[PDB]
Amino acid sequence: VSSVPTKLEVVAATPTSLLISWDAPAVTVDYYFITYGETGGNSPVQEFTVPGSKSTATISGLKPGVDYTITVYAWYYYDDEYYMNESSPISINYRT
Amino acid sequence: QAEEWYFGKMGRKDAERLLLNPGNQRGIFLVRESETTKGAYSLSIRDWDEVRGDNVKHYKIRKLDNGGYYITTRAQFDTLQKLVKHYTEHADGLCHKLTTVCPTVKPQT
């Protein structure tokens, strides 16, 4: 059964903010881990989470005209032994 | 290793009860032996959420056949100390970055 989210995309974009969206996997997700950062940049990526009930997220404070790499991971319960697992990622790029 | 964050043999619910003490902020943590996978560890972290309030999350630290330790296979570490340092620098998927070790009651002085 799928744990990787699918079809990640930007669905709204201003010069400094993006709304990303994806299709949840079939497993119940505890929360999503989302990173974004300048592609090939030499600073650390930004990181945040959204609740596992969601399948979108708002990214704010971007610099106009910068290519960003945006990645989403699902963190989810499997069984009592594997109680907290990270899915494979899905990633997109977007230039503001 | 017998480091400050290492609590040795400790059960999941007992780790939760200790971390959920009033006064512990998010990111307070401990490392213990796993009771469900032999040879693995568990990183137990005090967290907070809008719906469930104060809570505790557990992350299994597994061992690589030849390599070191990992919670997620993309981030691997030669030692537990290096793992803890990494997740003190950035949460990198954890519910919260690690701050300081869970306190315990000490003898009166």
Residue B36: CATH number of its domain? 3.30.505.10
* Distance in angstroms (rounded) separating the CA atoms of residues A32 and A55: 9
Q: How far is CA B46 from the centre of its chain?
A: 9
Number of structural domains found in chain A: 1
Range of the domain at A40: 1-96
What residues of chain B lie within 8 A of the CB of A82, using their CB?
Answer: 60
Resolution in angstroms, to 1 decimal, for this deposition?
1.9
Residue with tokens 């040879």: B39
**Are B36 and A81 an interchain contact pair (Cβ–Cβ within 8 Å)?**
yes
* Distance in angstroms (rounded) separating the CA atoms of residues B1 and B81: 8
**Are B92 and A47 an interchain contact pair (Cβ–Cβ within 8 Å)?**
yes
What residues of chain A lie within 8 A of the CB of B57, using their CB?
Answer: 84
Q: What are phi and psi of B85, to 5 degrees?
A: -60, -45
User: What amino acid is encoded at B42 in this protein?
Assistant: S
After which residues is chain A discontinuous, taking C to N > 2.5 Å?
A: none
Q: What is the CATH number of the domain that holds A96?
A: 2.60.40.10
* Distance in angstroms (rounded) separating the CA atoms of residues A92 and A71: 7
Q: How was this structure determined?
A: X-ray
**Are B90 and A47 an interchain contact pair (Cβ–Cβ within 8 Å)?**
yes
Number of structural domains found in chain B: 1
Are the C-beta atoms of A22 and A72 separated by less than 8 Å? yes
Half-sphere exposure (CA, 13 Å, Cβ side) for B82?
8
Residue with tokens 């993006």: A18
Range of the domain at B89: 1-109
**Are B95 and A49 an interchain contact pair (Cβ–Cβ within 8 Å)?**
yes
For residue B45, list its beta bridge partners: B29, B57
> Cβ contacts of residue A33 below 8 Å, gap of 6+?
A47, A49, A72, A73, A74, A75, A86, B93
